[PDB]
Amino acid sequence: STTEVVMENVTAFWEEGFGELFEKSFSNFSLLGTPVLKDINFKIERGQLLAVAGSTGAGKTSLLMMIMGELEPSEGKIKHSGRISFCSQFSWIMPGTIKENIIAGVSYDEYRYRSVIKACQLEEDISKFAEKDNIVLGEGGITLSGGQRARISLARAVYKDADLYLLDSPFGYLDVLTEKEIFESCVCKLMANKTRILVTSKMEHLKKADKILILHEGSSYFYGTFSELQNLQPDFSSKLMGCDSFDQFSAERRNSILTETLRRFSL
Amino acid sequence: STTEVVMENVTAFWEEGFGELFEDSLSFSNFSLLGTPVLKDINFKIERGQLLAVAGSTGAGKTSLLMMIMGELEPSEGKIKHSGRISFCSQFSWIMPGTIKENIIAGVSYDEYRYRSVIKACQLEEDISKFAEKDNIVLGEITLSGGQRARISLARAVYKDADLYLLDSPFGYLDVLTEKEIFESCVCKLMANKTRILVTSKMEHLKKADKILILHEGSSYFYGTFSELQNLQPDFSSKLMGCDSFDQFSAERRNSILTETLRRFSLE
Amino acid sequence: STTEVVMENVTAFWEEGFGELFEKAKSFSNFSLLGTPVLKDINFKIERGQLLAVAGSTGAGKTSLLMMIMGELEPSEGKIKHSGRISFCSQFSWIMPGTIKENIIAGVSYDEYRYRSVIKACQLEEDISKIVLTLSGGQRARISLARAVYKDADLYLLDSPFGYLDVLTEKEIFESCVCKLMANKTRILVTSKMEHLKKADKILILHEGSSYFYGTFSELQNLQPDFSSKLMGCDSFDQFSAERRNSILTETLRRFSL
Amino acid sequence: TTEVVMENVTAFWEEGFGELFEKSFSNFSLLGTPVLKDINFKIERGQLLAVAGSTGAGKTSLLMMIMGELEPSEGKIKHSGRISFCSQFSWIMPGTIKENIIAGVSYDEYRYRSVIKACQLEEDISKFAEKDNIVLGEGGITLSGGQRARISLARAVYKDADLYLLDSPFGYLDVLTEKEIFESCVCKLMANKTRILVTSKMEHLKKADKILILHEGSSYFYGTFSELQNLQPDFSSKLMGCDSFDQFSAERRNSILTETLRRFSL
Amino acid sequence: TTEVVMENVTAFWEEGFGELFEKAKQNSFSNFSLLGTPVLKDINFKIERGQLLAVAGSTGAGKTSLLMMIMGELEPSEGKIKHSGRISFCSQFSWIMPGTIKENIIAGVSYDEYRYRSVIKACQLEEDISKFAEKDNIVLGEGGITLSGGQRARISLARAVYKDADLYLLDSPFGYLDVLTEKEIFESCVCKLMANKTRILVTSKMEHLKKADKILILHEGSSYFYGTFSELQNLQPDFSSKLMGCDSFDQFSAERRNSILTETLRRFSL
Numbered sequence A: 001s002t003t004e005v006v007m008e009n010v011t012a013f014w015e016e017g018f019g020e021l022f023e024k025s026f027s028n029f030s031l032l033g034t035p036v037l038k039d040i041n042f043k044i045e046r047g048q049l050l051a052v053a054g055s056t057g058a059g060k061t062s063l064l065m066m067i068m069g070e071l072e073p074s075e076g077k078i079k080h081s082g083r084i085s086f087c088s089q090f091s092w093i094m095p096g097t098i099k100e101n102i103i104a105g106v107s108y109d110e111y112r113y114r115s116v117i118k119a120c121q122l123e124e125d126i127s128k129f130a131e132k133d134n135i136v137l138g139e140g141g142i143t144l145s146g147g148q149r150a151r152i153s154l155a156r157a158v159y160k161d162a163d164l165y166l167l168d169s170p171f172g173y174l175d176v177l178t179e180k181e182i183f184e185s186c187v188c189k190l191m192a193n194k195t196r197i198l199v200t201s202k203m204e205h206l207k208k209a210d211k212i213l214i215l216h217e218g219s220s221y222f223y224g225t226f227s228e229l230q231n232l233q234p235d236f237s238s239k240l241m242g243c244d245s246f247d248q249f250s251a252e253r254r255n256s257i258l259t260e261t262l263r264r265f266s267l
Numbered sequence B: 001s002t003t004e005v006v007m008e009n010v011t012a013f014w015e016e017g018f019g020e021l022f023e024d025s026l027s028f029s030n031f032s033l034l035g036t037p038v039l040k041d042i043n044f045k046i047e048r049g050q051l052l053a054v055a056g057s058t059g060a061g062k063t064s065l066l067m068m069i070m071g072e073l074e075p076s077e078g079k080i081k082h083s084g085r086i087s088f089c090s091q092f093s094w095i096m097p098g099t100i101k102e103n104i105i106a107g108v109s110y111d112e113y114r115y116r117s118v119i120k121a122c123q124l125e126e127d128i129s130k131f132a133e134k135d136n137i138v139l140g141e142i143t144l145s146g147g148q149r150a151r152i153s154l155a156r157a158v159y160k161d162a163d164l165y166l167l168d169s170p171f172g173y174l175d176v177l178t179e180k181e182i183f184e185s186c187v188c189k190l191m192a193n194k195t196r197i198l199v200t201s202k203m204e205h206l207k208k209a210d211k212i213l214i215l216h217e218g219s220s221y222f223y224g225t226f227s228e229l230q231n232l233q234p235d236f237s238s239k240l241m242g243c244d245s246f247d248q249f250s251a252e253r254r255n256s257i258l259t260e261t262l263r264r265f266s267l268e
Numbered sequence C: 001s002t003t004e005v006v007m008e009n010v011t012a013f014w015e016e017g018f019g020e021l022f023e024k025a026k027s028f029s030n031f032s033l034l035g036t037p038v039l040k041d042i043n044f045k046i047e048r049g050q051l052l053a054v055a056g057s058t059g060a061g062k063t064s065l066l067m068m069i070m071g072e073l074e075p076s077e078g079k080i081k082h083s084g085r086i087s088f089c090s091q092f093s094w095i096m097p098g099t100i101k102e103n104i105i106a107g108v109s110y111d112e113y114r115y116r117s118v119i120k121a122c123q124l125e126e127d128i129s130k131i132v133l134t135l136s137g138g139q140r141a142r143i144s145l146a147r148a149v150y151k152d153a154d155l156y157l158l159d160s161p162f163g164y165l166d167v168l169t170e171k172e173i174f175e176s177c178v179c180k181l182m183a184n185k186t187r188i189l190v191t192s193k194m195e196h197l198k199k200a201d202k203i204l205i206l207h208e209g210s211s212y213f214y215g216t217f218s219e220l221q222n223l224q225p226d227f228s229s230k231l232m233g234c235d236s237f238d239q240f241s242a243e244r245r246n247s248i249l250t251e252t253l254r255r256f257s258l
Numbered sequence D: 001t002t003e004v005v006m007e008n009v010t011a012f013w014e015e016g017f018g019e020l021f022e023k024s025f026s027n028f029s030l031l032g033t034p035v036l037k038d039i040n041f042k043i044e045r046g047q048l049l050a051v052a053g054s055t056g057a058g059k060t061s062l063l064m065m066i067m068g069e070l071e072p073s074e075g076k077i078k079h080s081g082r083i084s085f086c087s088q089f090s091w092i093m094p095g096t097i098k099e100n101i102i103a104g105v106s107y108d109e110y111r112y113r114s115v116i117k118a119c120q121l122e123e124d125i126s127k128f129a130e131k132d133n134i135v136l137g138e139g140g141i142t143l144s145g146g147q148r149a150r151i152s153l154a155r156a157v158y159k160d161a162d163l164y165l166l167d168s169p170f171g172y173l174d175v176l177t178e179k180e181i182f183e184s185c186v187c188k189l190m191a192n193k194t195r196i197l198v199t200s201k202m203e204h205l206k207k208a209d210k211i212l213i214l215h216e217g218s219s220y221f222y223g224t225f226s227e228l229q230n231l232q233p234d235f236s237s238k239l240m241g242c243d244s245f246d247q248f249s250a251e252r253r254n255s256i257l258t259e260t261l262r263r264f265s266l
Numbered sequence E: 001t002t003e004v005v006m007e008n009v010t011a012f013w014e015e016g017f018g019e020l021f022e023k024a025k026q027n028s029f030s031n032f033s034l035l036g037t038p039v040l041k042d043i044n045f046k047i048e049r050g051q052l053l054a055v056a057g058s059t060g061a062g063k064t065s066l067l068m069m070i071m072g073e074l075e076p077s078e079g080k081i082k083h084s085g086r087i088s089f090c091s092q093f094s095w096i097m098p099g100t101i102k103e104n105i106i107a108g109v110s111y112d113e114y115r116y117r118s119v120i121k122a123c124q125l126e127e128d129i130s131k132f133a134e135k136d137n138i139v140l141g142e143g144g145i146t147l148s149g150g151q152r153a154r155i156s157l158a159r160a161v162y163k164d165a166d167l168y169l170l171d172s173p174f175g176y177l178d179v180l181t182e183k184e185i186f187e188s189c190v191c192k193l194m195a196n197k198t199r200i201l202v203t204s205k206m207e208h209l210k211k212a213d214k215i216l217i218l219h220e221g222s223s224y225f226y227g228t229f230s231e232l233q234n235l236q237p238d239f240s241s242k243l244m245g246c247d248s249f250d251q252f253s254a255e256r257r258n259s260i261l262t263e264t265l266r267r268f269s270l
């Protein structure tokens, strides 16, 4: 099964102190703080892809955290139901095998597991190891490349059967071509009929999305389709540079991207 | 089973030299001005079984106050009253070489009921059952997440049967929801009849506490209940932002919070 | 984990005075005759993970048997064997002040996966998605069951939890909840429905405090082809309260409107 | 605390038959019926008197006479000091749980915490984020019957008095909670105080220092439980005034069930 | 969404024999009904809400007829049939209407942008529509002229799936596709797009039987087997092509085989 997600006039603070103060001669104590999310409105139907974009600190992860209940609204309405699956910006590797890391407590299913490792391009990493997917890794994933950790992390999120998938920029340690292929095979094909929210800065991902949400300083800059945004603002393509770009990338990230490029052509 | 904690006009210096210095028509000197006390004129009283929340910004002397109760820091003036054994959970989550079970038990006599009640309240059942070796898998001084280490370190402090529990911000590496759940199940439920002092910046924790103590640069800013303080200072919610906020968190703290979030939606 | 439940030659009195008099009795006298035991010579065994259906006419002692297991009622004679935690769903659908989450969680620790599973099995997913507690009779019934089912226990005692539901919703929840989600748990279900007795590993029929039948449904069908609604303690719809009737109707409307 | 003495006490609820009893032979008092007749007992400081009898026997009326609502036409009543009264009716004031328990007298944190412990109100208070200071209205809406019963007893017990009059305060509780609170509150916390408890429970009679059985306003039995067992091995639910569960209101049965549910869920 | 239940169902296509079976049922004795042969005899199965039933069996076993009975064209002479809601039907015959591809898929029912897009993706029609100059608005005549067999099959499936129904009856919709495309569409359409819908799929593919929640094997009008694929394989380790109704490639028409070849060519030439 899958779920709708609806937000109506949502405002939220990470600080518990400022939240209560917002819910209240005159005075205005709320001003001493700043809302992380302000007047958020959207509705995504069952099985749709919502792409969320915006510059650093805009509140993209925070929006996901609010769906997950870590951040609570001080105003407005959130509607969604069922199980959540989360893929974080941080790729987390569990002590155990690659199979164990993907399955993560869920019952093993042959067809599902194979679909997922195929979609996330782990077949060559899963067979060309000493003892297949039974090789033991530790917490952190020292013996794995950044690209491997990202793909295992995505595989784990996609293997879980859920009503809502929250994907926080899962391709950032991958090279361009691998990102394009996995977006298509995983997010567009394997997850085709699951409601999903993807944090991304890729214009292509926005193009394929059913709905887009541009966040600016916690506020809704634009909600609708990419075509509508392009028609109103033919310049926006340039503002997409002011989101997540190279040279601002850390050292290990660039090295991971290079390693993923090397993997492609070494075959 | 549990102790009262009293402090009367307590002033203290970490530096022994400035402490010794501490204890107009005519000529006078004032050498004690050369040093600043870490704690100054501290007064509070916590009854048996009560919860005291201690808050304040970085460097205000919260850990130092706990250190004083432990006898690491010594008073130059005033009296400190507390009896029985002390248990201490630090900001630093310490992992002993050995197993998880031995890490929680750590010398203290083994009891089946108590141990299982502790690992439940600290949400360690799922961590213990997942490993092939159960709670008999070996650890160094790592292949553990920040959240796991924090949970084990709390479990250890809680397992010990003591008259006074000192909890120095034990939830920092946990996500919001896990923190809420463990505060309720461990601090509030399993430890309900125990005297405990909790260093925290969370409004909810201050609300639940019987008494609160707000420290400012080593001095008592407020002592009483949270309601009394909110009634006196409708501002205070804003002051609590200037305590321990996300903007200062290190990378490994931020990432520990994130994988605790992952754990909830990926495991069990 | 889960537990076995054993009852050997059990007799019990709700009135302590008559209970203690049976113990004192344990030319001649028989002062114990002045009272009447609520349960008399009860014998059954339910294996770990099995379902016991308890049926019988109004006042036969179905709830009291559950109260005895919970220790509210004490035996004057015999042995009762059960270990671990008990979870109880009453005929009364209790709603606490607080949220729906707080009502379901009710003093045990929150677990995300388990929570979502229980919401699914009790058909509360749409209800929950739509705040202090407003509710339909059906919603109250489902939340109250969800609470009992959410608690991790060795033994589940379910006292007629489906009464305020329409036939179709009761069937679906008995399947998803009692049969599937709770498949490996020891459960005792007070019910009057043929389908439930068919599915149970064992059935106990009570009559005026005594054991009328113990065994399987198929064994009962041979010995009693003459169905009795009175003896089984079946629903008398014309005697249902206006509240109960309208709850059943509302649940029927819900199926076809939402 | 106080002693309670009653010597040859007879009383009428109606003022008319009062002085008529206090008076050719004529007896106009006969067309009235005395609610209590020739009552005799003596309970020492710190002792528990258990009072039992069928419905309408005069158990509550006896408490009412001690409180002064009912005046004797004959005999002597001796008791001194303040009285605390816990009624069959569980009453809730406008205001918070704390204020409901405190009820006017000066706050004492130690005494208060002891009372809420003994009356099992700790989970009730700690559940709310507003704790002790969340408001309730008159009637006790949004509270369960079990909670009202516990708050009402808490109020009665918190009050410092020489004599405590407890009129069947457990009726809306399940068997187990009644047993636990009888023990922790009436038997332990109030062990130093003189108390009179109207009850039907055999267990309460055993723990009492003295028991008084009423029947139609007259003293059927006065003495210990052991003496009563000797004299009367034939237990009678009717005579002891045992609760007929089938005669319970929907709200009372549902209260008991909610208390049962509270125990196994929390 | 709906449940489908059949219990001891018998049916005749010929009305005369159906009425004869019922008239002799209520009533020295006679048995006139033996003169006819029922298309379906003693049918028993159950599929729950949102589940996939796979129906297999040899040619003439009565697979389409069972679908025809659910649709009310064939009437039961005996037994219980339970189902509710709207039915959508995809036939072995790929029907093309006069009109555009859009009109063909929509089929009068209201247009919904997202639903339409979801269906054309799941049925692999995105390439086809875009490849045409006027896109969705290219005019098709009745029957077959302009489109390939694979295209006709995908449009016909898309129409069935676009309709909002509580029961989807899919009578061997992939026969004119190559193996790889059939695999992909069974996954993307039948399993994912229709994941929460009650569906009955007539098929001869082991893969489909494996994925189904329940299978129903038909043999000369009667229930040969009902259960899961695991239960079947445990109770029958010997595979029979004839019994399962496995479509023999030799017994395919020239147009069918060439449609399969065209689909393979499409994959490698675009």
Ligand SMILES: Nc1ncnc2c1ncn2[C@@H]1O[C@H](COP(=O)(O)OP(=O)(O)OP(=O)(O)O)[C@@H](O)[C@H]1O
Pocket (backbone or CB within 6 Å): A014, A036, A054, A055, A056, A057, A058, A059, A060, A061, A062, A063, A089, B246, B247, B257
């Ligand atoms: N766990 C948290 N607790 C408190 N504040 C947080 C937390 N996570 C993020 N924030 C705050 O929320 C605000 C928005 O940050 P957020 O991480 O949601 O931005 P983002 O759009 O995901 O940025 P980026 O593109 O770099 O990932 C920031 O001020 C940040 O400090």
Ligand SMILES: Nc1ncnc2c1ncn2[C@@H]1O[C@H](COP(=O)(O)OP(=O)(O)OP(=O)(O)O)[C@@H](O)[C@H]1O
Pocket (backbone or CB within 6 Å): B014, B015, B038, B056, B057, B058, B059, B060, B061, B062, B063, B064, B065, B091
């Ligand atoms: N072990 C120590 N020896 C000497 N000085 C110390 C020691 N620990 C803390 N201090 C000093 O005491 C002062 C107060 O520090 P303390 O750690 O008690 O503040 P805090 O309230 O716990 O701050 P934080 O919230 O960052 O933990 C600081 O000047 C600090 O350098």
Ligand SMILES: Nc1ncnc2c1ncn2[C@@H]1O[C@H](COP(=O)(O)OP(=O)(O)OP(=O)(O)O)[C@@H](O)[C@H]1O
Pocket (backbone or CB within 6 Å): C014, C015, C038, C056, C057, C058, C059, C060, C061, C062, C063, C064, C065, C233, D245, D246, D256
């Ligand atoms: N809490 C109680 N205290 C005293 N007597 C009780 C109590 N509960 C039930 N009884 C009595 O026990 C006897 C059996 O009642 P019980 O409620 O167990 O029957 P039941 O089978 O559950 O009937 P129903 O179908 O109406 O639920 C009755 O006489 C009833 O009055």
Ligand SMILES: Nc1ncnc2c1ncn2[C@@H]1O[C@H](COP(=O)(O)OP(=O)(O)OP(=O)(O)O)[C@@H](O)[C@H]1O
Pocket (backbone or CB within 6 Å): D013, D035, D053, D054, D055, D056, D057, D058, D059, D060, D061, D062, D241
């Ligand atoms: N306030 C009153 N004013 C006048 N008569 C009263 C009053 N209260 C009780 N009575 C009468 O006193 C008689 C005895 O009743 P009482 O309430 O003392 O019996 P009880 O033993 O408490 O019965 P129960 O077990 O039902 O509580 C009854 O006739 C009753 O009507």
Ligand SMILES: Nc1ncnc2c1ncn2[C@@H]1O[C@H](COP(=O)(O)OP(=O)(O)OP(=O)(O)O)[C@@H](O)[C@H]1O
Pocket (backbone or CB within 6 Å): E013, E039, E057, E058, E059, E060, E061, E062, E063, E064, E065, E066, E245
């Ligand atoms: N519309 C109809 N009217 C009358 N008889 C029919 C009709 N359709 C099919 N039949 C007959 O019903 C019987 C069963 O044929 P049916 O088409 O249902 O088998 P099938 O399993 O679908 O075979 P196939 O694999 O070739 O499609 C045959 O005798 C057939 O002639």
Ligand SMILES: [Mg+2]
Pocket (backbone or CB within 6 Å): A060, A061, A062, A089
């Ligand atoms: Mg982010």
Ligand SMILES: [Mg+2]
Pocket (backbone or CB within 6 Å): B062, B063, B064, B091
């Ligand atoms: Mg510190």
Ligand SMILES: [Mg+2]
Pocket (backbone or CB within 6 Å): C062, C063, C064, C091, C159
């Ligand atoms: Mg009952």
Ligand SMILES: [Mg+2]
Pocket (backbone or CB within 6 Å): D059, D060, D061, D088, D167
């Ligand atoms: Mg009375």
Ligand SMILES: [Mg+2]
Pocket (backbone or CB within 6 Å): E063, E064, E065, E092, E171
């Ligand atoms: Mg056919």
